[PDB]
Design a protein around this ligand. Structure first.
Ligand SMILES: *[C@@H]1O[C@H](CO)[C@@H](O[C@@H]2O[C@H](CO)[C@@H](O[C@@H]3O[C@H](CO[C@H]4O[C@H](CO)[C@@H](O)[C@H](O)[C@@H]4O)[C@@H](O)[C@H](O[C@H]4O[C@H](CO)[C@@H](O)[C@H](O)[C@@H]4O)[C@@H]3O)[C@H](O)[C@H]2NC(C)=O)[C@H](O)[C@H]1NC(C)=O
Ligand SMILES: *[C@@H]1O[C@H](CO)[C@@H](O[C@@H]2O[C@H](CO)[C@@H](O[C@@H]3O[C@H](CO)[C@@H](O)[C@H](O)[C@@H]3O)[C@H](O)[C@H]2NC(C)=O)[C@H](O)[C@H]1NC(C)=O
Ligand SMILES: *[C@@H]1O[C@H](CO)[C@@H](O)[C@H](O)[C@H]1NC(C)=O
Ligand SMILES: *[C@@H]1O[C@H](CO)[C@@H](O)[C@H](O)[C@H]1NC(C)=O
Ligand SMILES: *[C@@H]1O[C@H](CO)[C@@H](O)[C@H](O)[C@H]1NC(C)=O
Ligand SMILES: *[C@@H]1O[C@H](CO)[C@@H](O)[C@H](O)[C@H]1NC(C)=O
Ligand SMILES: *[C@@H]1O[C@H](CO)[C@@H](O)[C@H](O)[C@H]1NC(C)=O
Ligand SMILES: *[C@@H]1O[C@H](CO)[C@@H](O)[C@H](O)[C@H]1NC(C)=O
Lengths: 50, 50, 200, 21, 50, 150, 50
């Protein structure tokens, strides 16, 4: 849970701000990093659990 | 020890944690405590560096 | 929802006047801009709306104006209930001020930029980049409790359902989750706290 | 006497205080 | 046994984010599948010898 | 009132009944405006300020502006106002790292970190700690006083 | 009793009260709103005693 607050290289730890503040294309760009961070942490958690 | 923090505010910079424990730098070192109950007939110039 | 405060708006304009193109559309003539008629400005009113104005003409024809953004925001976004504890615009270099540039492309495409705009600002609910001078005496905030709704709770955008929670947290205003999610925010105007639930 | 009871608290001379509770 | 909608974890129901999630394909699906497969395995075995 | 510059803050009301708009007048030669400090909250409990301009209100940094030097008071608490003063205690404060236990956004207990046992505790997250082997840093020079080598 | 810091294993609250949302979200609600759901233990301690 605590992983997701880390603003993973993005402008913010939440997404709609990214959508609102900049044009969708760039907002997509930034959110990609958050997306990757979240899933990656999931992966590590998953492997640990397994 | 024994102080109950009748009104003491933890210094949350944006949003306050409701419950838990946090290690942080807060001004808990006490200098020249003044506790005057319901009296201030004073024209005072509190100055730092002193 | 932001801090209770006097209904105060100041229209931000920043007029940019330029002439490009020359002969065969590949030349330039002039370019300048001001923040509401001045080279710099700072918002004091709680509300403020940018109204970008353009006296930009290609001597050969039309000018395509493209926006640069070295800023956490866009001109179309700042008015969208963006919140600051301060916000200042300079036409010249300003320390720790994000950059927004404009590029004027004439019909034959000189490709030049407009003046760099520098925005030194700090987040807060003191002044709000507004789309329109907000209404409401002593408070411009509005909410729909028990309603799945958009919100900007002291800058906390999002979607959720607002339910009065009878809690009486003396300290703090809006408390976030352990996972950095705003769980309850106090009206503070009434000193009452509302829990927020994601709609889905 | 209860004076030792109040002595238990770390304290210094100009500490004009009120114990409560 | 633990479960999580990694789609929600990353997107939190944001459809605009949901499309972006989709392009990373089964990452989320595989994660959840591993979780549930494992968990149901333990469920059935522990119910077995019990 | 909410306008010093359009109206007088000559208050026509007493004992609140209205969250009193707090405005903060700049008093320099080329700036003499009242910045809206804050709508008066229903009840303030504790206020803390810092050298570097931290106007901190009820767990919130309302201003936390550039460094303050003279925090001067003229609270007219004279005459019978000597029994009207809100000043009940004030304590000068130095920042210190400490672990805070809080519940219901209410302070419960504290633990400083200067002591090595306490240093380990605040280095950890729990006031109590278990008997075991714990990482620790060799004590550096307590006085920073780092010479420059170039 | 000495080990279960929660007192009981039953403390895994039904997420329905989480969906209530009238009061402030708890840790269970924090993770649920994040998309996490802890499943009940496959068997209770009473069955283990049995
Ligand atoms: C809300 O968020 C704001 C964001 O800025 C916080 O503001 C900062 O808070 C920190 C917390 O204390 C301040 O840190 C202190 O800075 C003081 C001034 O900085 C000088 O000194 C330090 C350390 O010497 C240098 O690194 C720096 O370059 C400056 O030269 C210092 O006096 C403090 O240091 C103390 O301890 C050190 C040892 O660690 C001693 O050597 C010092 O002599 C001193 O005793 C401390 O570093 C920081 O200054 C604040 N920002 C600004 C711009 O001042 C708010 O605190 C935060 N919380 C609220 C508002 O409640
Ligand atoms: C938080 O709680 C406060 C406390 O009620 C709410 O403030 C209330 O705000 C409304 C409108 O903003 C006020 O209504 C008033 O009604 C009269 C009569 O119709 C009208 O003349 C006024 O112009 C105003 O519309 C109401 O008096 C006021 N209550 C107070 C000050 O005690 C507030 O709306 C709640 N939410 C927020 C986000 O502040
Ligand atoms: C009030 O301010 C004046 C200067 O503005 C100062 O001389 C005086 O000491 C202060 N206090 C009182 C009680 O007058
Ligand atoms: C700060 O304090 C030192 C020593 O007390 C003194 O020499 C110096 O003049 C002071 N400066 C200011 C600005 O108060
Ligand atoms: C800015 O635009 C607003 C309307 O959007 C107008 O009322 C105001 O006069 C303009 N100010 C300047 C300086 O252009
Ligand atoms: C045209 O440009 C001049 C200076 O370049 C400026 O004063 C004027 O406001 C501009 N007109 C418009 C409509 O922006
Ligand atoms: C708060 O408690 C009061 C008194 O029991 C009750 O009437 C009210 O419904 C409660 N509200 C919430 C959100 O718990
Ligand atoms: C205020 O600052 C401006 C900026 O330089 C200066 O021109 C002006 O003279 C100042 N006001 C005074 C000194 O009264």
């Amino acid at each position: 849970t605590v992983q997701l607050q880390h603003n993973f290289q993005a402008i913010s730890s939440s997404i709609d701000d990214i959508y609102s503040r900049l044009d969708p294309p760039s907002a997509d760009v930034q959110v990609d990093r958050l997306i990757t961070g979240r899933l990656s942490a999931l992966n590590a958690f998953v492997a640990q659990t397994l | 020890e024994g102080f109950s923090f009748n009104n003491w505010f933890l210094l949350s910079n944006d949003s306050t944690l409701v419950h838990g424990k946090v290690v942080s730098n807060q001004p808990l070192l006490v200098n020249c405590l003044l506790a005057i109950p319901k009296i201030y007939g004073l024209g005072q110039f509190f100055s730092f560096n002193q | 929802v932001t801090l209770p405060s006097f209904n105060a708006h100041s229209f931000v304009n920043i007029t940019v006047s330029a002439s490009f193109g020359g002969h065969s559309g590949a030349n330039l003539i002039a370019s300048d801009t001001t923040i509401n008629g001045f080279s710099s400005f700072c918002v004091d009113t709680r509300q403020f709306t940018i109204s970008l104005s353009y006296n930009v003409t290609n001597s050969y024809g039309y000018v395509s104006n493209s926006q640069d953004s070295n800023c956490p925001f866009t001109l179309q976004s700042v008015n969208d209930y963006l919140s600051f504890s301060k916000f200042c615009v300079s036409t010249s270099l300003l320390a720790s001020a994000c950059t927004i540039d404009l590029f004027g492309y004439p019909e034959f495409g000189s490709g030049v930029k407009f003046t760099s705009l520098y925005f030194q600002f700090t987040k807060g609910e003191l002044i709000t980049g507004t789309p329109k001078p907000l209404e409401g005496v002593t408070d411009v905030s509005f909410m729909t409790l028990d309603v799945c709704t958009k919100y900007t709770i002291y800058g906390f955008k999002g979607e959720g359902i607002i339910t009065l929670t009878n809690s009486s947290f003396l300290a703090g205003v809006y408390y976030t989750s352990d996972s950095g999610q705003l769980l309850a925010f106090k009206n503070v105007t009434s000193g009452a706290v509302y829990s927020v639930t994601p709609c889905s | 006497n209860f004076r030792r009871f109040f002595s238990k608290f770390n304290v210094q001379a100009p500490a004009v205080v009120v114990l409560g509770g | 046994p633990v479960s999580v909608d990694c789609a929600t974890y990353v997107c939190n129901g944001n459809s605009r984010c949901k499309q972006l999630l989709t392009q990373y394909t089964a990452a989320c699906k595989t994660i959840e599948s591993a979780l549930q497969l494992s968990a149901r395995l333990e469920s059935v075995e522990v119910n077995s010898m019990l | 009132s909410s306008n010093p510059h359009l109206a007088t803050f000559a208050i026509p009301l007493g004992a609140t009944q209205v969250p009193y708009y707090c405005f903060f007048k700049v008093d320099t030669y080329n700036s003499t405006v009242y910045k809206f400090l804050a709508v008066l909250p229903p009840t303030v409990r504790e206020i803390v300020i810092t050298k570097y301009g931290d106007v901190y209100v009820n767990g919130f940094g309302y201003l936390h502006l550039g460094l303050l030097d003279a925090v001067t008071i003229n609270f007219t608490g004279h005459g019978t106002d000597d029994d009207v003063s809100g000043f009940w205690t004030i304590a000068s404060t130095n920042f210190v790292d400490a672990l805070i236990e809080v519940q219901g956004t209410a302070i419960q207990r504290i633990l400083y970190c200067d002591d090595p046992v306490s240093q380990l505790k605040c280095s950890q997250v729990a006031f109590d700690l278990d008997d075991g082997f714990y990482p620790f840093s060799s004590r550096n020079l307590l006085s920073h006083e780092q010479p420059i080598s170039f | 009793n000495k080990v279960v810091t929660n007192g009981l294993g039953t403390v895994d609250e039904d997420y329905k009260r989480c969906s209530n949302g009238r009061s402030v979200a708890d840790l269970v609600c924090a993770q649920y709103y994040s998309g996490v759901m802890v499943l009940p233990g496959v068997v209770d301690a009473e069955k283990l005693h049995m």
